[PDB]
Amino acid sequence: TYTVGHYLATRLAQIGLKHHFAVAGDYNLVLLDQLLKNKDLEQVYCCNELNCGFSAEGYARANGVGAAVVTFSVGALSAFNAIGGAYAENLPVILISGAPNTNDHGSGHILHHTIGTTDYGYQLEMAKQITCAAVSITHAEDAPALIDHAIRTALREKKPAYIEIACNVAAQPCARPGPVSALLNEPTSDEETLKAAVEAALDFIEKREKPVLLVGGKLRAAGAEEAVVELADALGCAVATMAAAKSFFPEDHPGYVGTYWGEVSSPGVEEIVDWADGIICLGPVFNDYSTVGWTAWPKGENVVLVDPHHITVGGEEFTGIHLKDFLTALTERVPKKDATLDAADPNAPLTRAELCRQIQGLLNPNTTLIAETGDSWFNAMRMKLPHGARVELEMQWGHIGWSVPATFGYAVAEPERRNVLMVGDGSFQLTAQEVAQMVRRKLPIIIFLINNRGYTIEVKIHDGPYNNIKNWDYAGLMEVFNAEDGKGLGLKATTGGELAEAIKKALAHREGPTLIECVIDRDDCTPELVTWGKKVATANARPPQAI
Numbered sequence: 001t002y003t004v005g006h007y008l009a010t011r012l013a014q015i016g017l018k019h020h021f022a023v024a025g026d027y028n029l030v031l032l033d034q035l036l037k038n039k040d041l042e043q044v045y046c047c048n049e050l051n052c053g054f055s056a057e058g059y060a061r062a063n064g065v066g067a068a069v070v071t072f073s074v075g076a077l078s079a080f081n082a083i084g085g086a087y088a089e090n091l092p093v094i095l096i097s098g099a100p101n102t103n104d105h106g107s108g109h110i111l112h113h114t115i116g117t118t119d120y121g122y123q124l125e126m127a128k129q130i131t132c133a134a135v136s137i138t139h140a141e142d143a144p145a146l147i148d149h150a151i152r153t154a155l156r157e158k159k160p161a162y163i164e165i166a167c168n169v170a171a172q173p174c175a176r177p178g179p180v181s182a183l184l185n186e187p188t189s190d191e192e193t194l195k196a197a198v199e200a201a202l203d204f205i206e207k208r209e210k211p212v213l214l215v216g217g218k219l220r221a222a223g224a225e226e227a228v229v230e231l232a233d234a235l236g237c238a239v240a241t242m243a244a245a246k247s248f249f250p251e252d253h254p255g256y257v258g259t260y261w262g263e264v265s266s267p268g269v270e271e272i273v274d275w276a277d278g279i280i281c282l283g284p285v286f287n288d289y290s291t292v293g294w295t296a297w298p299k300g301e302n303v304v305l306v307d308p309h310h311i312t313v314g315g316e317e318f319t320g321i322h323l324k325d326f327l328t329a330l331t332e333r334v335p336k337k338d339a340t341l342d343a344a345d346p347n348a349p350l351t352r353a354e355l356c357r358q359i360q361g362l363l364n365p366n367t368t369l370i371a372e373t374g375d376s377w378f379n380a381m382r383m384k385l386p387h388g389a390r391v392e393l394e395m396q397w398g399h400i401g402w403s404v405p406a407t408f409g410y411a412v413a414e415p416e417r418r419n420v421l422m423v424g425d426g427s428f429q430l431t432a433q434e435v436a437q438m439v440r441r442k443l444p445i446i447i448f449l450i451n452n453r454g455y456t457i458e459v460k461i462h463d464g465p466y467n468n469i470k471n472w473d474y475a476g477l478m479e480v481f482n483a484e485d486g487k488g489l490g491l492k493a494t495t496g497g498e499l500a501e502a503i504k505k506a507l508a509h510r511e512g513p514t515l516i517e518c519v520i521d522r523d524d525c526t527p528e529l530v531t532w533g534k535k536v537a538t539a540n541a542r543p544p545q546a547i
Protein backbone atom coordinates (compact mmCIF):
# COMPACT_ATOMS: atom_id res chain seq x y z
CA THR A 1 0.00 0.00 0.00
CA TYR A 2 1.38 3.34 -1.13
CA THR A 3 2.21 6.13 1.31
CA VAL A 4 3.01 9.84 1.13
CA GLY A 5 6.67 8.99 0.65
CA HIS A 6 6.02 6.58 -2.22
CA TYR A 7 3.51 8.89 -3.89
CA LEU A 8 6.01 11.76 -3.93
CA ALA A 9 8.85 9.48 -5.02
CA THR A 10 6.85 8.07 -7.94
CA ARG A 11 5.44 11.46 -8.96
CA LEU A 12 9.02 12.73 -9.20
CA ALA A 13 10.17 9.72 -11.22
CA GLN A 14 7.20 9.97 -13.60
CA ILE A 15 7.93 13.58 -14.54
CA GLY A 16 11.63 12.78 -15.08
CA LEU A 17 13.81 12.61 -12.00
CA LYS A 18 16.32 9.78 -11.94
CA HIS A 19 17.90 11.45 -8.89
CA HIS A 20 16.61 13.55 -6.00
CA PHE A 21 19.10 15.30 -3.72
CA ALA A 22 18.91 15.27 0.06
CA VAL A 23 20.45 16.16 3.43
CA ALA A 24 19.55 13.96 6.39
CA GLY A 25 17.61 15.28 9.39
CA ASP A 26 15.33 13.84 12.04
CA TYR A 27 12.17 15.26 10.45
CA ASN A 28 12.79 14.07 6.88
CA LEU A 29 14.49 10.88 8.10
CA VAL A 30 11.36 8.70 7.96
CA LEU A 31 10.42 10.56 4.78
CA LEU A 32 13.82 9.90 3.17
CA ASP A 33 13.48 6.17 3.86
CA GLN A 34 10.32 6.03 1.78
CA LEU A 35 11.79 8.11 -1.05
CA LEU A 36 14.21 5.20 -1.56
CA LYS A 37 11.46 2.67 -2.16
CA ASN A 38 11.25 3.80 -5.79
CA LYS A 39 14.17 2.19 -7.61
CA ASP A 40 13.98 4.45 -10.68
CA LEU A 41 14.66 7.40 -8.36
CA GLU A 42 17.99 7.55 -6.56
CA GLN A 43 18.72 9.42 -3.32
CA VAL A 44 21.86 11.53 -3.75
CA TYR A 45 23.26 13.18 -0.62
CA CYS A 46 25.06 16.49 -0.14
CA CYS A 47 27.34 18.30 2.30
CA ASN A 48 25.02 21.17 3.26
CA GLU A 49 21.58 22.34 2.13
CA LEU A 50 22.65 25.57 0.44
CA ASN A 51 24.51 23.34 -2.01
CA CYS A 52 21.92 20.53 -2.07
CA GLY A 53 19.37 22.98 -3.46
CA PHE A 54 21.80 24.34 -6.03
CA SER A 55 22.57 20.76 -7.11
CA ALA A 56 18.87 20.26 -7.85
CA GLU A 57 19.17 23.58 -9.68
CA GLY A 58 21.80 22.16 -12.02
CA TYR A 59 20.02 18.81 -12.41
CA ALA A 60 16.98 20.71 -13.66
CA ARG A 61 19.10 22.41 -16.31
CA ALA A 62 19.92 19.00 -17.78
CA ASN A 63 16.81 16.97 -16.95
CA GLY A 64 14.31 19.85 -17.20
CA VAL A 65 13.17 19.48 -13.57
CA GLY A 66 14.88 18.73 -10.25
CA ALA A 67 14.17 18.20 -6.57
CA ALA A 68 15.71 18.37 -3.09
CA VAL A 69 14.94 17.42 0.51
CA VAL A 70 15.90 19.08 3.79
CA THR A 71 15.21 19.37 7.52
CA PHE A 72 12.80 21.89 8.96
CA SER A 73 13.88 25.55 8.82
CA VAL A 74 17.54 24.84 9.61
CA GLY A 75 17.94 23.08 6.27
CA ALA A 76 15.23 24.81 4.26
CA LEU A 77 16.12 28.43 5.04
CA SER A 78 19.49 28.00 3.29
CA ALA A 79 17.84 26.13 0.42
CA PHE A 80 15.52 29.13 -0.09
CA ASN A 81 18.59 30.85 -1.54
CA ALA A 82 18.67 28.18 -4.26
CA ILE A 83 14.88 28.28 -4.70
CA GLY A 84 15.27 32.00 -5.24
CA GLY A 85 17.88 31.07 -7.83
CA ALA A 86 15.44 28.62 -9.40
CA TYR A 87 12.64 31.18 -9.69
CA ALA A 88 15.20 33.65 -11.06
CA GLU A 89 16.42 31.21 -13.73
CA ASN A 90 12.96 29.66 -14.47
CA LEU A 91 13.79 26.16 -13.17
CA PRO A 92 11.06 23.90 -11.85
CA VAL A 93 13.08 22.89 -8.78
CA ILE A 94 10.77 21.18 -6.27
CA LEU A 95 11.94 21.74 -2.70
CA ILE A 96 10.69 19.41 0.05
CA SER A 97 11.09 19.81 3.77
CA GLY A 98 10.42 17.70 6.77
CA ALA A 99 8.13 19.31 9.30
CA PRO A 100 6.88 19.05 12.89
CA ASN A 101 4.53 16.32 14.07
CA THR A 102 0.78 16.56 13.48
CA ASN A 103 0.08 16.43 17.24
CA ASP A 104 2.42 19.41 17.79
CA HIS A 105 0.67 21.82 15.39
CA GLY A 106 -0.97 24.55 17.44
CA SER A 107 -0.17 22.48 20.54
CA GLY A 108 1.62 25.18 22.52
CA HIS A 109 4.87 23.21 22.31
CA ILE A 110 8.26 24.60 21.36
CA LEU A 111 10.17 22.37 18.96
CA HIS A 112 13.79 22.09 17.92
CA HIS A 113 15.13 23.65 14.70
CA THR A 114 12.64 26.50 15.20
CA ILE A 115 12.73 30.08 16.42
CA GLY A 116 11.34 29.28 19.89
CA THR A 117 7.87 30.58 19.09
CA THR A 118 4.91 28.23 19.31
CA ASP A 119 4.21 28.82 15.60
CA TYR A 120 5.81 26.75 12.83
CA GLY A 121 4.17 28.31 9.77
CA TYR A 122 6.86 30.97 9.46
CA GLN A 123 8.75 28.65 7.12
CA LEU A 124 6.18 28.20 4.37
CA GLU A 125 5.11 31.78 4.96
CA MET A 126 8.62 32.54 3.71
CA ALA A 127 8.73 29.88 0.99
CA LYS A 128 5.49 31.22 -0.55
CA GLN A 129 7.33 34.49 -1.18
CA ILE A 130 9.90 32.84 -3.50
CA THR A 131 7.96 29.90 -4.98
CA CYS A 132 5.03 29.64 -7.37
CA ALA A 133 3.44 26.96 -5.16
CA ALA A 134 3.78 26.14 -1.46
CA VAL A 135 2.16 23.14 0.16
CA SER A 136 2.01 21.77 3.70
CA ILE A 137 0.97 18.15 4.15
CA THR A 138 -0.40 17.57 7.63
CA HIS A 139 -2.85 14.78 6.75
CA ALA A 140 -2.16 11.79 4.53
CA GLU A 141 -5.58 12.02 2.89
CA ASP A 142 -4.79 15.49 1.53
CA ALA A 143 -1.37 14.30 0.32
CA PRO A 144 -1.86 13.18 -3.29
CA ALA A 145 -4.00 16.14 -4.35
CA LEU A 146 -1.52 18.72 -3.01
CA ILE A 147 1.66 17.03 -4.23
CA ASP A 148 0.13 16.94 -7.71
CA HIS A 149 -0.65 20.65 -7.38
CA ALA A 150 2.92 21.55 -6.35
CA ILE A 151 4.46 19.62 -9.25
CA ARG A 152 1.81 20.50 -11.84
CA THR A 153 2.14 24.23 -11.17
CA ALA A 154 5.94 24.20 -11.14
CA LEU A 155 6.09 22.61 -14.61
CA ARG A 156 3.41 24.83 -16.16
CA GLU A 157 5.02 27.95 -14.66
CA LYS A 158 8.63 26.81 -15.01
CA LYS A 159 9.17 28.11 -11.45
CA PRO A 160 10.02 26.20 -8.24
CA ALA A 161 7.61 24.71 -5.70
CA TYR A 162 7.71 23.80 -2.01
CA ILE A 163 6.28 20.87 -0.03
CA GLU A 164 6.54 20.53 3.76
CA ILE A 165 5.47 17.14 5.10
CA ALA A 166 4.98 16.34 8.77
CA CYS A 167 7.51 13.66 9.70
CA ASN A 168 4.89 11.35 11.20
CA VAL A 169 2.59 11.83 8.19
CA ALA A 170 5.22 10.81 5.63
CA ALA A 171 4.76 7.17 6.72
CA GLN A 172 0.96 7.03 6.66
CA PRO A 173 -0.92 5.24 3.84
CA CYS A 174 -2.01 7.27 0.83
CA ALA A 175 -3.74 6.82 -2.53
CA ARG A 176 -2.06 5.67 -5.77
CA PRO A 177 -0.87 8.23 -8.33
CA GLY A 178 -3.18 8.88 -11.21
CA PRO A 179 -1.84 8.82 -14.74
CA VAL A 180 1.08 11.17 -15.21
CA SER A 181 -0.79 13.11 -17.90
CA ALA A 182 -2.79 14.75 -15.10
CA LEU A 183 0.28 16.89 -14.37
CA LEU A 184 1.80 17.69 -17.78
CA ASN A 185 -0.89 18.72 -20.28
CA GLU A 186 -1.06 22.50 -20.57
CA PRO A 187 -3.47 25.24 -21.62
CA THR A 188 -2.66 26.27 -25.17
CA SER A 189 -3.06 29.63 -26.80
CA ASP A 190 -6.37 30.97 -27.99
CA GLU A 191 -6.57 30.71 -31.78
CA GLU A 192 -8.18 34.14 -32.27
CA THR A 193 -5.48 35.97 -30.32
CA LEU A 194 -2.87 33.69 -31.89
CA LYS A 195 -4.14 34.46 -35.40
CA ALA A 196 -4.06 38.22 -34.83
CA ALA A 197 -0.76 38.07 -32.95
CA VAL A 198 0.93 36.57 -36.01
CA GLU A 199 -0.77 38.97 -38.41
CA ALA A 200 0.46 42.09 -36.62
CA ALA A 201 3.95 40.59 -36.38
CA LEU A 202 4.03 39.96 -40.15
CA ASP A 203 3.30 43.65 -40.74
CA PHE A 204 6.10 44.71 -38.39
CA ILE A 205 8.66 43.00 -40.66
CA GLU A 206 6.93 43.55 -44.02
CA LYS A 207 7.09 47.32 -43.51
CA ARG A 208 10.85 46.84 -43.13
CA GLU A 209 13.79 45.43 -45.06
CA LYS A 210 16.43 44.73 -42.38
CA PRO A 211 15.05 42.75 -39.43
CA VAL A 212 17.07 41.22 -36.60
CA LEU A 213 16.47 38.34 -34.21
CA LEU A 214 17.35 38.57 -30.52
CA VAL A 215 17.24 35.38 -28.46
CA GLY A 216 16.17 35.88 -24.85
CA GLY A 217 17.08 34.06 -21.67
CA LYS A 218 13.57 32.68 -21.08
CA LEU A 219 13.54 30.69 -24.33
CA ARG A 220 14.43 27.37 -22.70
CA ALA A 221 11.48 27.54 -20.29
CA ALA A 222 9.10 28.04 -23.23
CA GLY A 223 10.53 24.93 -24.91
CA ALA A 224 10.92 26.94 -28.11
CA GLU A 225 14.59 26.38 -28.98
CA GLU A 226 13.47 24.30 -31.98
CA ALA A 227 10.91 26.78 -33.34
CA VAL A 228 13.45 29.63 -33.23
CA VAL A 229 15.70 27.63 -35.57
CA GLU A 230 12.81 27.13 -38.02
CA LEU A 231 12.09 30.88 -37.88
CA ALA A 232 15.70 32.02 -38.23
CA ASP A 233 15.90 29.90 -41.39
CA ALA A 234 12.45 30.60 -42.87
CA LEU A 235 13.11 34.29 -42.20
CA GLY A 236 16.87 34.21 -42.91
CA CYS A 237 17.70 37.36 -40.95
CA ALA A 238 20.69 37.98 -38.68
CA VAL A 239 20.24 36.23 -35.31
CA ALA A 240 21.97 37.25 -32.06
CA THR A 241 21.79 36.02 -28.46
CA MET A 242 21.42 38.06 -25.29
CA ALA A 243 23.59 38.33 -22.19
CA ALA A 244 22.08 35.04 -21.04
CA ALA A 245 20.82 32.53 -23.63
CA LYS A 246 24.39 31.77 -24.76
CA SER A 247 24.13 28.41 -26.58
CA PHE A 248 20.34 28.65 -26.72
CA PHE A 249 20.69 29.21 -30.47
CA PRO A 250 23.24 27.12 -32.43
CA GLU A 251 26.25 29.03 -33.65
CA ASP A 252 26.45 27.03 -36.88
CA HIS A 253 23.38 28.36 -38.68
CA PRO A 254 23.97 31.09 -41.27
CA GLY A 255 22.11 33.93 -39.52
CA TYR A 256 23.90 33.70 -36.18
CA VAL A 257 26.02 36.81 -35.70
CA GLY A 258 27.07 36.42 -32.07
CA THR A 259 26.13 37.88 -28.69
CA TYR A 260 24.27 41.17 -28.18
CA TRP A 261 25.02 42.70 -24.78
CA GLY A 262 25.09 46.46 -25.35
CA GLU A 263 28.40 48.24 -25.86
CA VAL A 264 30.21 45.11 -24.62
CA SER A 265 28.76 42.89 -27.35
CA SER A 266 31.06 40.30 -28.86
CA PRO A 267 32.72 41.81 -31.95
CA GLY A 268 30.43 43.04 -34.68
CA VAL A 269 27.03 42.43 -33.10
CA GLU A 270 26.19 45.78 -31.52
CA GLU A 271 26.29 47.36 -34.95
CA ILE A 272 23.84 44.98 -36.61
CA VAL A 273 21.05 45.65 -34.11
CA ASP A 274 21.53 49.43 -33.95
CA TRP A 275 21.50 49.66 -37.74
CA ALA A 276 18.55 47.39 -38.32
CA ASP A 277 14.82 47.84 -38.89
CA GLY A 278 13.23 46.40 -35.78
CA ILE A 279 14.26 43.70 -33.32
CA ILE A 280 12.44 40.47 -32.40
CA CYS A 281 13.19 39.68 -28.76
CA LEU A 282 12.14 36.14 -27.85
CA GLY A 283 11.57 36.09 -24.10
CA PRO A 284 14.32 38.47 -22.95
CA VAL A 285 15.30 39.52 -19.44
CA PHE A 286 16.39 43.17 -19.54
CA ASN A 287 17.74 44.48 -16.24
CA ASP A 288 20.53 46.58 -14.75
CA TYR A 289 23.07 43.93 -15.80
CA SER A 290 21.56 42.70 -19.08
CA THR A 291 21.08 46.27 -20.29
CA VAL A 292 24.57 47.16 -19.04
CA GLY A 293 23.73 50.12 -16.83
CA TRP A 294 20.36 50.67 -18.53
CA THR A 295 22.16 51.65 -21.74
CA ALA A 296 21.27 48.71 -24.05
CA TRP A 297 17.51 48.24 -23.65
CA PRO A 298 15.33 47.90 -26.79
CA LYS A 299 12.32 50.20 -27.02
CA GLY A 300 8.84 49.39 -28.37
CA GLU A 301 8.23 51.20 -31.66
CA ASN A 302 10.91 49.12 -33.41
CA VAL A 303 10.56 46.03 -31.19
CA VAL A 304 8.48 42.88 -31.05
CA LEU A 305 8.54 41.45 -27.52
CA VAL A 306 7.53 37.79 -27.41
CA ASP A 307 7.57 37.02 -23.70
CA PRO A 308 6.48 33.56 -22.56
CA HIS A 309 2.73 34.19 -22.30
CA HIS A 310 2.11 37.72 -23.61
CA ILE A 311 3.19 39.37 -26.86
CA THR A 312 3.57 43.10 -27.44
CA VAL A 313 3.85 44.41 -31.00
CA GLY A 314 4.18 48.10 -31.79
CA GLY A 315 0.89 49.63 -30.64
CA GLU A 316 -0.88 46.39 -29.67
CA GLU A 317 -0.89 43.78 -26.92
CA PHE A 318 -1.84 40.11 -26.73
CA THR A 319 -2.24 37.71 -23.82
CA GLY A 320 -3.30 34.11 -23.55
CA ILE A 321 -0.72 33.03 -26.13
CA HIS A 322 2.53 31.06 -25.85
CA LEU A 323 5.98 31.87 -27.21
CA LYS A 324 6.20 28.43 -28.85
CA ASP A 325 2.74 28.43 -30.47
CA PHE A 326 3.53 31.95 -31.72
CA LEU A 327 6.85 30.94 -33.30
CA THR A 328 5.26 27.84 -34.85
CA ALA A 329 2.48 29.71 -36.64
CA LEU A 330 4.91 32.52 -37.55
CA THR A 331 7.43 30.23 -39.30
CA GLU A 332 5.04 29.73 -42.21
CA ARG A 333 3.62 33.09 -43.27
CA VAL A 334 6.98 34.77 -42.74
CA PRO A 335 8.76 36.11 -45.86
CA LYS A 336 12.52 35.91 -46.19
CA LYS A 337 14.14 39.25 -45.32
CA ASP A 338 17.88 39.48 -44.72
CA ALA A 339 20.44 41.77 -43.05
CA THR A 340 23.80 40.19 -43.87
CA LEU A 341 26.80 41.44 -41.90
CA ASP A 342 29.11 41.98 -44.89
CA ALA A 343 48.21 31.13 -30.93
CA ALA A 344 50.24 32.33 -27.93
CA ASP A 345 53.58 31.42 -26.29
CA PRO A 346 54.09 28.62 -23.74
CA ASN A 347 56.51 28.71 -20.79
CA ALA A 348 55.77 32.38 -20.13
CA PRO A 349 53.38 33.59 -17.40
CA LEU A 350 49.79 32.58 -18.04
CA THR A 351 47.47 35.19 -19.57
CA ARG A 352 43.70 35.31 -19.50
CA ALA A 353 43.86 35.27 -23.29
CA GLU A 354 45.86 32.04 -23.30
CA LEU A 355 43.65 29.84 -21.14
CA CYS A 356 40.43 31.28 -22.56
CA ARG A 357 41.94 30.20 -25.88
CA GLN A 358 43.18 26.83 -24.66
CA ILE A 359 39.93 26.06 -22.83
CA GLN A 360 38.14 26.57 -26.14
CA GLY A 361 40.09 23.54 -27.34
CA LEU A 362 38.01 21.32 -25.08
CA LEU A 363 34.71 22.33 -26.68
CA ASN A 364 33.23 19.05 -28.00
CA PRO A 365 29.59 18.74 -29.16
CA ASN A 366 29.29 16.52 -26.07
CA THR A 367 30.43 19.36 -23.80
CA THR A 368 28.61 21.63 -21.34
CA LEU A 369 30.56 24.71 -20.20
CA ILE A 370 29.41 25.91 -16.77
CA ALA A 371 30.57 29.53 -16.43
CA GLU A 372 30.44 30.99 -12.91
CA THR A 373 29.48 34.52 -11.95
CA GLY A 374 32.62 36.61 -12.25
CA ASP A 375 34.79 37.56 -15.17
CA SER A 376 34.23 33.96 -16.31
CA TRP A 377 30.90 35.25 -17.70
CA PHE A 378 32.69 37.28 -20.36
CA ASN A 379 35.17 34.58 -21.38
CA ALA A 380 32.38 32.12 -22.18
CA MET A 381 30.57 34.77 -24.24
CA ARG A 382 33.60 35.10 -26.55
CA MET A 383 34.13 31.37 -27.08
CA LYS A 384 32.93 29.75 -30.30
CA LEU A 385 30.65 26.75 -29.69
CA PRO A 386 30.15 23.56 -31.70
CA HIS A 387 26.71 22.30 -32.56
CA GLY A 388 25.21 20.49 -29.59
CA ALA A 389 27.58 22.25 -27.20
CA ARG A 390 25.93 23.84 -24.18
CA VAL A 391 26.72 26.75 -21.88
CA GLU A 392 25.12 27.34 -18.46
CA LEU A 393 25.05 30.81 -16.88
CA GLU A 394 23.23 31.97 -13.74
CA MET A 395 22.86 35.66 -14.49
CA GLN A 396 19.47 36.61 -13.04
CA TRP A 397 20.34 35.36 -9.53
CA GLY A 398 24.12 35.43 -9.69
CA HIS A 399 24.92 33.62 -6.43
CA ILE A 400 28.68 33.04 -6.55
CA GLY A 401 29.52 29.44 -5.77
CA TRP A 402 26.42 28.34 -7.66
CA SER A 403 28.58 26.72 -10.35
CA VAL A 404 30.16 24.04 -8.14
CA PRO A 405 27.02 22.35 -6.72
CA ALA A 406 25.16 22.98 -10.01
CA THR A 407 28.00 21.34 -11.94
CA PHE A 408 27.79 18.33 -9.60
CA GLY A 409 24.05 18.19 -10.26
CA TYR A 410 24.18 18.75 -14.02
CA ALA A 411 26.77 15.97 -14.19
CA VAL A 412 24.57 13.43 -12.37
CA ALA A 413 21.95 13.84 -15.10
CA GLU A 414 24.42 13.99 -18.03
CA PRO A 415 27.45 12.02 -16.78
CA GLU A 416 28.76 10.97 -20.22
CA ARG A 417 29.15 14.60 -21.36
CA ARG A 418 32.39 16.52 -20.99
CA ASN A 419 31.44 18.78 -18.10
CA VAL A 420 33.70 21.86 -17.86
CA LEU A 421 33.58 24.42 -15.05
CA MET A 422 34.95 27.96 -15.20
CA VAL A 423 34.95 29.22 -11.60
CA GLY A 424 36.89 32.06 -9.97
CA ASP A 425 38.95 31.81 -6.80
CA GLY A 426 36.37 33.64 -4.67
CA SER A 427 33.23 31.98 -5.97
CA PHE A 428 34.80 28.54 -5.40
CA GLN A 429 35.29 29.21 -1.68
CA LEU A 430 31.58 29.59 -0.94
CA THR A 431 30.59 26.09 -2.05
CA ALA A 432 33.84 24.16 -2.44
CA GLN A 433 32.94 21.15 -0.31
CA GLU A 434 30.54 19.92 -2.98
CA VAL A 435 33.59 18.86 -5.00
CA ALA A 436 33.94 16.04 -2.44
CA GLN A 437 30.64 14.72 -3.83
CA MET A 438 32.00 14.73 -7.38
CA VAL A 439 34.62 12.41 -5.89
CA ARG A 440 32.05 10.35 -4.00
CA ARG A 441 30.04 9.77 -7.18
CA LYS A 442 33.21 9.60 -9.33
CA LEU A 443 32.20 12.11 -11.98
CA PRO A 444 34.54 13.20 -15.00
CA ILE A 445 34.34 16.94 -14.36
CA ILE A 446 37.07 19.37 -15.41
CA ILE A 447 37.26 22.30 -12.97
CA PHE A 448 39.11 25.39 -14.21
CA LEU A 449 39.75 27.28 -10.97
CA ILE A 450 40.45 30.77 -12.35
CA ASN A 451 42.74 31.88 -9.51
CA ASN A 452 43.41 35.64 -9.36
CA ARG A 453 43.42 36.33 -5.58
CA GLY A 454 40.36 38.55 -5.39
CA TYR A 455 36.79 39.32 -6.34
CA THR A 456 38.07 40.65 -9.64
CA ILE A 457 34.64 41.42 -11.11
CA GLU A 458 33.82 43.37 -7.93
CA VAL A 459 37.14 45.23 -8.15
CA LYS A 460 36.06 46.81 -11.42
CA ILE A 461 32.67 47.87 -10.06
CA HIS A 462 34.05 49.58 -6.94
CA ASP A 463 37.39 48.50 -5.47
CA GLY A 464 38.30 48.18 -1.81
CA PRO A 465 39.82 45.99 0.91
CA TYR A 466 36.64 43.89 1.00
CA ASN A 467 37.50 42.45 -2.42
CA ASN A 468 40.86 40.94 -1.37
CA ILE A 469 40.27 37.33 -0.26
CA LYS A 470 42.51 34.89 1.57
CA ASN A 471 44.23 32.59 -0.92
CA TRP A 472 44.18 28.79 -0.67
CA ASP A 473 46.25 26.05 -2.23
CA TYR A 474 43.24 25.40 -4.43
CA ALA A 475 45.08 22.58 -6.23
CA GLY A 476 45.79 20.57 -3.08
CA LEU A 477 42.14 20.48 -1.96
CA MET A 478 41.32 17.50 -4.22
CA GLU A 479 43.61 15.20 -2.22
CA VAL A 480 41.90 16.03 1.08
CA PHE A 481 38.54 14.95 -0.33
CA ASN A 482 39.95 11.84 -2.03
CA ALA A 483 41.21 10.86 1.42
CA GLU A 484 40.98 7.07 1.51
CA ASP A 485 38.66 5.95 -1.31
CA GLY A 486 38.11 8.60 -3.97
CA LYS A 487 40.04 9.09 -7.19
CA GLY A 488 40.42 12.65 -8.49
CA LEU A 489 43.20 14.86 -9.91
CA GLY A 490 44.30 18.20 -8.44
CA LEU A 491 46.65 20.23 -10.62
CA LYS A 492 48.04 23.73 -11.15
CA ALA A 493 49.10 25.90 -14.10
CA THR A 494 51.22 29.09 -13.92
CA THR A 495 52.17 29.08 -17.61
CA GLY A 496 50.60 28.68 -21.03
CA GLY A 497 52.41 25.38 -21.43
CA GLU A 498 51.52 23.85 -18.05
CA LEU A 499 47.90 24.35 -19.09
CA ALA A 500 48.24 21.89 -21.98
CA GLU A 501 49.83 19.31 -19.68
CA ALA A 502 46.97 19.67 -17.19
CA ILE A 503 44.29 19.53 -19.90
CA LYS A 504 45.68 16.28 -21.34
CA LYS A 505 45.81 14.80 -17.86
CA ALA A 506 42.19 15.95 -17.39
CA LEU A 507 40.83 14.39 -20.60
CA ALA A 508 42.95 11.34 -19.74
CA HIS A 509 41.74 10.95 -16.16
CA ARG A 510 38.59 8.93 -15.55
CA GLU A 511 36.94 7.74 -12.32
CA GLY A 512 36.63 11.28 -10.93
CA PRO A 513 37.03 15.04 -11.22
CA THR A 514 40.03 17.17 -12.19
CA LEU A 515 40.77 20.63 -10.78
CA ILE A 516 43.34 22.97 -12.33
CA GLU A 517 44.47 26.03 -10.35
CA CYS A 518 45.11 28.29 -13.33
CA VAL A 519 46.95 31.22 -11.71
CA ILE A 520 46.69 34.62 -13.45
CA ASP A 521 46.81 38.36 -12.68
CA ARG A 522 43.79 40.17 -11.25
CA ASP A 523 43.91 43.27 -13.45
CA ASP A 524 44.53 41.01 -16.46
CA CYS A 525 40.90 40.63 -17.55
CA THR A 526 38.45 40.89 -20.42
CA PRO A 527 37.95 44.41 -21.84
CA GLU A 528 34.19 44.00 -21.40
CA LEU A 529 34.32 43.62 -17.61
CA VAL A 530 36.38 46.84 -17.51
CA THR A 531 33.87 49.01 -19.39
CA TRP A 532 30.98 46.94 -17.97
CA GLY A 533 31.59 47.52 -14.26
CA LYS A 534 31.58 51.27 -14.87
CA LYS A 535 27.99 51.18 -16.12
CA VAL A 536 26.91 48.97 -13.21
CA ALA A 537 28.81 50.92 -10.56
CA THR A 538 27.27 54.27 -11.51
CA ALA A 539 23.75 52.91 -12.10
CA ASN A 540 23.96 51.09 -8.75
CA ALA A 541 24.78 54.36 -6.94
CA ARG A 542 22.85 56.93 -8.90
CA PRO A 543 21.21 59.54 -6.67
CA PRO A 544 17.53 59.96 -5.80
CA GLN A 545 15.55 62.66 -7.60
CA ALA A 546 13.87 65.08 -5.23
CA ILE A 547 10.18 65.85 -5.71
Ligand SMILES: Cc1ncc(C[n+]2csc(CCOP(=O)(O)OP(=O)(O)O)c2C)c(N)n1
Pocket residue numbers: 373374375376398399400423424425426427428430450452454455456457458
Ligand atom coordinates in the same frame (compact mmCIF):
# COMPACT_ATOMS: atom_id res chain seq x y z
C1 LIG B 1 26.62 34.86 -2.35
C2 LIG B 1 27.12 36.08 -3.05
N1 LIG B 1 27.89 37.00 -2.38
C3 LIG B 1 28.36 38.12 -3.03
C4 LIG B 1 28.05 38.33 -4.36
C5 LIG B 1 28.58 39.55 -5.06
N2 LIG B 1 29.65 39.16 -5.93
C6 LIG B 1 29.52 38.99 -7.29
S1 LIG B 1 30.86 38.55 -8.03
C7 LIG B 1 31.65 38.52 -6.66
C8 LIG B 1 33.10 38.18 -6.79
C9 LIG B 1 33.42 36.90 -7.55
O1 LIG B 1 34.80 36.62 -7.36
P1 LIG B 1 35.58 35.64 -8.37
O2 LIG B 1 34.88 34.31 -8.58
O3 LIG B 1 37.05 35.47 -8.04
O4 LIG B 1 35.50 36.49 -9.73
P2 LIG B 1 36.78 36.57 -10.69
O5 LIG B 1 37.89 37.24 -9.92
O6 LIG B 1 37.19 35.20 -11.17
O7 LIG B 1 36.37 37.43 -11.85
C10 LIG B 1 30.92 38.90 -5.54
C11 LIG B 1 31.47 38.96 -4.14
C12 LIG B 1 27.28 37.41 -5.04
N3 LIG B 1 26.95 37.58 -6.32
N4 LIG B 1 26.82 36.30 -4.37
Ligand SMILES: [Mg+2]
Pocket residue numbers: 374424425426450451452453454455456
Ligand atom coordinates in the same frame (compact mmCIF):
# COMPACT_ATOMS: atom_id res chain seq x y z
MG1 LIG C 1 39.02 35.37 -9.66
